[PDB]
Amino acid sequence: DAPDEFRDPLMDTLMTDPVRLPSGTIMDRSIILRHLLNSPTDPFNRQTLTESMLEPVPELKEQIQAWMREK
């Protein structure tokens, strides 16, 4: 299994492409972008959210790729 900080909020899925929202939530880029196709909102607190507000988390993305190298 994988540590919680490498997984999407509430989910079992590994974030291969983590992004931070302005609120502080970190989640996979592929989830939040598909949510934004339907609604211009942060899905958790309902604030306005657009794609340009998302930030990469390079150190976490690298740490996750490093963890994937344990097979």
Author numbering: 1098 to 1168
Paper lines:
We report the development of three ubiquitin variants (UbVs), each binding selectively to the RING or U-box domain of a distinct E3 ligase: monomeric UBE4B, phosphorylated active CBL, or dimeric XIAP. With ∼600 members, the RING/U-box E3s form the largest family. This family uses a RING or U-box domain to recruit E2 enzymes thioesterified with Ub (E2∼Ub) and facilitates transfer of Ub directly to substrate. RING/U-box domains promote Ub transfer by shifting the equilibrium of E2∼Ub into a closed conformation (Dou et al., 2012b, Plechanovová et al., 2012, Pruneda et al., 2012). We generated selective UbVs for each RING/U-box domain and used biochemical assays and structural studies to identify two types of UbVs: competitive inhibitors of E2∼Ub binding sites on UBE4B or phosphorylated CBL and an activator of XIAP.
UBE4B is known as a Ub elongation factor or E4 because it binds preformed Ub conjugates and catalyzes formation of polyubiquitin chains (Kaneko et al., 2003, Koegl et al., 1999). UbV.E4B selectively inhibited E4B, the U-box domain of UBE4B. We attempted to co-crystallize UbV.E4B with several E4B U-box variants of differing lengths. A crystal structure of UBE4B U-box comprising residue 1,097 to the C terminus (E4B1097–C) was determined to a resolution of 1.48 Å, but no crystals of a complex with UbV.E4B were obtained. We therefore undertook nuclear magnetic resonance (NMR) experiments to map the complex interface. To investigate whether UbV.E4B and E2 compete for the same binding site on E4B, we monitored CSPs in 15N-UbcH5B competition experiments. Addition of equimolar E4B to 15N-UbcH5B strongly affected several residue peaks within the spectra indicating formation of 15N-UbcH5B-E4B complex. Subsequent titration of UbV.E4B caused 15N-UbcH5B signals to shift back to free E2 positions, showing that UbV.E4B inhibits E4B by occupying the E2-binding site.
